[PDB]
Design an enzyme around this catalytic site. Structure first.
Site, PDB file in Angstrom:
ATOM      1  N   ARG A  55       0.841  -1.184  -0.150  1.00  0.00           N
ATOM      2  CA  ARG A  55      -0.019  -0.092  -0.131  1.00  0.00           C
ATOM      3  C   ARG A  55       1.047   1.223  -0.047  1.00  0.00           C
ATOM      4  NH1 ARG A  55      -4.335   3.470   3.049  1.00  0.00           N
ATOM      5  NH2 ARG A  55      -3.111   3.212   4.907  1.00  0.00           N
TER       6      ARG A  55
ATOM      7  N   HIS B 285       1.037   3.893  -2.602  1.00  0.00           N
ATOM      8  CA  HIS B 285       0.181   5.441  -2.257  1.00  0.00           C
ATOM      9  C   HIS B 285       1.441   6.487  -2.500  1.00  0.00           C
ATOM     10  CE1 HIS B 285      -3.483   5.275   0.302  1.00  0.00           C
ATOM     11  NE2 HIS B 285      -3.517   4.192  -0.617  1.00  0.00           N
TER      12      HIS B 285
ATOM     13  N   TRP C 146     -10.455  -8.902   2.438  1.00  0.00           N
ATOM     14  CA  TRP C 146     -11.037  -9.126   1.268  1.00  0.00           C
ATOM     15  C   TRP C 146     -11.065 -10.616   1.007  1.00  0.00           C
ATOM     16  CZ3 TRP C 146      -7.459  -5.100   1.729  1.00  0.00           C
ATOM     17  CH2 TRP C 146      -7.822  -3.949   1.455  1.00  0.00           C
TER      18      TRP C 146
HETATM   19  C1  ZNH Z   1      -9.700   2.287  -6.814  1.00  0.00           C
HETATM   20  C2  ZNH Z   1      -8.438   2.099  -6.034  1.00  0.00           C
HETATM   21  C3  ZNH Z   1      -8.257   1.682  -4.802  1.00  0.00           C
HETATM   22  C4  ZNH Z   1      -9.063   2.285  -3.586  1.00  0.00           C
HETATM   23  C5  ZNH Z   1      -9.882   3.457  -3.335  1.00  0.00           C
HETATM   24  C6  ZNH Z   1      -8.224   1.736  -2.513  1.00  0.00           C
HETATM   25  C7  ZNH Z   1      -8.711   1.997  -1.090  1.00  0.00           C
HETATM   26  C8  ZNH Z   1      -8.174   1.423   0.077  1.00  0.00           C
HETATM   27  C9  ZNH Z   1      -8.482   1.677   1.156  1.00  0.00           C
HETATM   28  C10 ZNH Z   1      -9.832   2.259   1.754  1.00  0.00           C
HETATM   29  C11 ZNH Z   1      -8.027   0.795   2.083  1.00  0.00           C
HETATM   30  C12 ZNH Z   1      -7.896   0.789   3.668  1.00  0.00           C
HETATM   31  C13 ZNH Z   1      -6.606   1.069   4.405  1.00  0.00           C
HETATM   32  C14 ZNH Z   1      -6.732   0.765   5.796  1.00  0.00           C
HETATM   33  O1  ZNH Z   1      -6.045   0.193   6.259  1.00  0.00           O
HETATM   34  O2  ZNH Z   1      -7.905   1.130   6.493  1.00  0.00           O
HETATM   35  C15 ZNH Z   1      -6.978   0.124   1.229  1.00  0.00           C
HETATM   36  C16 ZNH Z   1      -5.907  -0.865   1.472  1.00  0.00           C
HETATM   37  C17 ZNH Z   1      -5.025  -1.525   0.942  1.00  0.00           C
HETATM   38  N1  ZNH Z   1      -4.949  -1.263  -0.378  1.00  0.00           N
HETATM   39 ZN1  ZNH Z   1      -6.067  -0.573  -1.673  1.00  0.00          ZN
HETATM   40  N2  ZNH Z   1      -7.205   1.131  -2.986  1.00  0.00           N
HETATM   41  C18 ZNH Z   1      -7.112   1.201  -4.368  1.00  0.00           C
HETATM   42  C19 ZNH Z   1      -6.296   0.500  -4.987  1.00  0.00           C
HETATM   43  C20 ZNH Z   1      -5.185  -0.344  -4.449  1.00  0.00           C
HETATM   44  C21 ZNH Z   1      -4.097  -0.783  -5.709  1.00  0.00           C
HETATM   45  C22 ZNH Z   1      -4.031  -0.359  -6.955  1.00  0.00           C
HETATM   46  C23 ZNH Z   1      -3.171  -1.626  -4.526  1.00  0.00           C
HETATM   47  C24 ZNH Z   1      -1.849  -2.019  -4.746  1.00  0.00           C
HETATM   48  C25 ZNH Z   1      -0.947  -2.158  -5.978  1.00  0.00           C
HETATM   49  C26 ZNH Z   1      -3.808  -1.431  -3.229  1.00  0.00           C
HETATM   50  C27 ZNH Z   1      -3.046  -2.215  -2.043  1.00  0.00           C
HETATM   51  C28 ZNH Z   1      -3.696  -2.094  -0.659  1.00  0.00           C
HETATM   52  C29 ZNH Z   1      -3.374  -2.815   0.333  1.00  0.00           C
HETATM   53  C30 ZNH Z   1      -2.299  -4.064   0.058  1.00  0.00           C
HETATM   54  C31 ZNH Z   1      -4.034  -2.521   1.480  1.00  0.00           C
HETATM   55  C32 ZNH Z   1      -4.127  -3.089   2.688  1.00  0.00           C
HETATM   56  C33 ZNH Z   1      -3.056  -2.542   3.686  1.00  0.00           C
HETATM   57  C34 ZNH Z   1      -2.965  -3.058   5.163  1.00  0.00           C
HETATM   58  O3  ZNH Z   1      -3.206  -4.379   5.275  1.00  0.00           O
HETATM   59  O4  ZNH Z   1      -2.611  -2.280   5.902  1.00  0.00           O
HETATM   60  N3  ZNH Z   1      -4.971  -0.649  -3.339  1.00  0.00           N
HETATM   61  N4  ZNH Z   1      -6.896   0.668  -0.153  1.00  0.00           N
END
Ligand code: ZNH
Ligand code: HEC
Ligand code: ZNH
EC number: 1.11.1.5
Lengths: 295, 104, 294
Positions: free
Chosen positions: A49, A53, A192
């Site tokens: 992540r 990001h 998930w």
């Molecule tokens: C449409 C579009 C979109 C959206 C609105 C989102 C949203 C989101 C939210 C609301 C959260 C929560 C934070 C906390 O810890 O509380 C997350 C987580 C998240 N995310 Zn994801 N994403 C996305 C795409 C994505 C992609 C394309 C990838 C890869 C390459 C991702 C990988 C992720 C991971 C591996 C996680 C978990 C982290 C931890 O375990 O701490 N993601 N993300």
């Protein structure tokens, strides 16, 4: 108007493949040691992540944001509401930066993600060095990261700013097989899938095979929950309401191997967006896992 | 009743803290010689607690067939860290052995 | 050839109150049939059963583990590495028929939690929901570790179970319980003096006795003390390695830290491969017979 930015990948002073395998290894060795974070999921998912990001802030029009500048280290985009929970992934990498002061922030944050995917049994993501740390005012405004409460149309339009096609977004979204959503971070609680620390195609299988019902949570936000205890964000669920996205979700659910080749290329592209690699730049480094080293 | 199967009980659950013969040194517990027909906190040489020499009772077969279930219930605030044998057959066999080994 | 998920399902209509009873039945029987293995009791063989059913797990494909309770089948039951556990099984069998609803996996694992708790050890949080799976999901013989190897093997073995150095050394402290029998394993003797009382004795003995390498009648080498204790070559590995030794010294000095670390690791060992939903109960902290006045 405003002239586009050009970012040239400058390799760290005197460093090569062997020096970066040592960084991968230090991150990989620590993923093993601190194995109890977030009720045994480990630090693996929060790092993917983080990689995403710091890269998804990119704007293909003026070449602002991206992974290059390593601007996640600054106040402005640190305390960004959309980046809540990543401070944990940062302080994981903080002692790895002490052992390797030479590496740039952009290179570390991106390597953190490439490593995490590989150690969690995913595909090899080719990675390149060259990201150089930029000043405090090269930091992008909050708001460039996507909303989870929208639809297939928003998801398409958003990812066009990141230069990704229908296939690349469906592939990238498959990383949601890893980890979970936390209520105090984003207003959504739950995982998930079942195997949330081993990179599989579970996301697509779960999205297709389960029974989902839309309901507001404790933070008063709507999410798709299954009777099995799984969850899908409205944006995740709208990978199936859309007929074009549904066909790619169907093919990745049926063939994990195609998802693996397509994820790699798209994940690399995401981390490499906005970076011009000179002619003399080293080839993409493919790192060996701790298991492939006997370590 | 077995003094032979009673020997195994002593070795297993007691010997790591107690000696049974005269001239047997005190470990994390006093020597058990001169037990049957003697007061609590008796053995010359150990530093007893203000709870055990003070229980002040004679040590016989049946009263300790009861202390043997709960060493903490029949004697409060002791340093005998043993949860006790709950069964009667096993307590019967340890007591049988003890009358032999703790005197001659 | 792969992709398995094992979802925990609480045995229909059963609460915490039901589970404390089955714990008590195992505890009251440990007290009853305490004549076994020269008054050591069934406690240690039950801790070992809980580990051998769980120690067959593979993080790569999620096969093996505690979930399926596949120990009830001939392949895993007749496993040469599982020799001696039949005694622990036969002990748990009358309890399984007093409570037919409980799954084999849940009973085998609870038997291990009951053993460690009744042995004056730490409280082990336990979760229900292991479902009995069919005969064809029984793992092949040979998933369990060998005892004649080094620190390298012990470190490599436990990675397959996602155990780090701190977790393996904590788990190895269970060897303060019971003994090795020549007729089962090909090794003979206890690790400590109080082999029916859960303490940090394993590490103290390991650091303080004069160990001498001797060969037994099964032709295997084992480290012996002239105090009547022994250590497997894999148990000695923990002091032959600087990383492992640092942790052995830490536990030998503080028992309450070992206790804290063992609970966490043992629960992890018994829960590996099992996915717990949201509509799942919190881990149960069972009360000992002593705390219920029984
Ligand atoms: C449409 C579009 C979109 C959206 C609105 C989102 C949203 C989101 C939210 C609301 C959260 C929560 C934070 C906390 O810890 O509380 C997350 C987580 C998240 N995310 Zn994801 N994403 C996305 C795409 C994505 C992609 C394309 C990838 C890869 C390459 C991702 C990988 C992720 C991971 C591996 C996680 C978990 C982290 C931890 O375990 O701490 N993601 N993300
Ligand atoms: C076997 C199962 C037994 C038996 C038959 C006994 N013990 Fe022992 N013991 C230990 C200590 C520290 C003490 C002293 C208690 C105090 O002063 O607070 C004792 C004492 C006894 C006594 C009474 C002593 C007296 O009043 O003279 C008897 C009759 C006795 N013990 C019998 C310690 C331990 C253990 C742990 C370190 C263990 C295990 C045992 N004892 C076991 C057993
Ligand atoms: N074992 Zn051992 N064992 C190991 C762990 C991680 C734990 C549990 C949390 C183990 C617990 C016991 C235990 C208690 C034993 C005594 C059983 C009894 O009294 O019947 C026990 N394990 C015993 C053995 C043993 C003896 C076989 C016999 O003759 O009954 C072994 C040869 C043995 C080996 C190993 C081993 C190798 C381990 C890991 C590196 C290990 C872990 N165990």
């Amino acid at each position: 108007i405003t002239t586009p930015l050009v970012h040239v990948a400058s390799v760290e002073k005197g460093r090569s493949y062997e020096d970066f395998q040592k960084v991968y290894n230090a991150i990989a060795l620590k993923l093993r040691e601190d194995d109890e974070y977030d009720n045994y999921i480990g630090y693996g998912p929060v790092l993917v992540r983080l990689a995403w990001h710091i890269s998804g802030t990119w704007d293909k029009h003026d070449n602002t944001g991206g992974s290059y500048g390593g601007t996640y280290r600054f106040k402005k985009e640190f305390n960004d509401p959309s980046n809540a929970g990543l401070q944990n992934g940062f302080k994981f990498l903080e002692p790895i930066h002490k052992e390797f002061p030479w590496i740039s922030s952009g290179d570390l944050f991106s390597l953190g993600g490439v490593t995490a995917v590989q150690e969690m049994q995913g595909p090899k993501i080719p990675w390149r060095c060259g990201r150089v740390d930029t000043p405090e005012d090269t930091t992008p405004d909050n708001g460039r990261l996507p909303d989870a409460d929208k639809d297939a149309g928003y998801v398409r339009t958003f990812f066009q700013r990141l230069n990704m096609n229908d296939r690349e977004v469906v592939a990238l979204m498959g990383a949601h097989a890893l980890g979970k959503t936390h209520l105090k971070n984003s207003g959504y609680e739950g995982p998930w899938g079942a195997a949330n620390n081993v990179f599989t195609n579970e996301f697509y299988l779960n999205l297709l095979n389960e029974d989902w019902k839309l309901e507001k949570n404790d933070a008063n936000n709507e999410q798709w929950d299954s009777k099995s205890g799984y969850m899908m964000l409205p944006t995740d669920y709208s990978l199936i309401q859309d007929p074009k996205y549904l066909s790619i979700v169907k093919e990745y659910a049926n063939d994990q191997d195609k998802f693996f080749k397509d994820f790699s290329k798209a994940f690399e592209k995401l981390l490499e967006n906005g970076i011009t690699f000179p002619k003399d730049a080293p080839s993409p480094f493919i790192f060996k896992t701790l298991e492939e080293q006997g370590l | 009743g077995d003094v032979e199967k009673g020997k195994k009980i002593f070795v297993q659950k007691c010997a790591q803290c107690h000696t049974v013969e005269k001239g047997g040194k005190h470990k994390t517990g006093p020597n058990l010689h001169g037990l049957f027909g003697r007061k609590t906190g008796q053995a010359p040489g150990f530093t007893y607690t203000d709870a055990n020499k003070n229980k002040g009772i004679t040590w016989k077969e049946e009263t300790l067939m009861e202390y043997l279930e709960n060493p903490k219930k029949y004697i409060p605030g002791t340093k005998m860290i043993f949860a006790g044998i709950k069964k009667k057959t096993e307590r019967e066999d340890l007591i049988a052995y003890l009358k032999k080994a703790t005197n001659e």
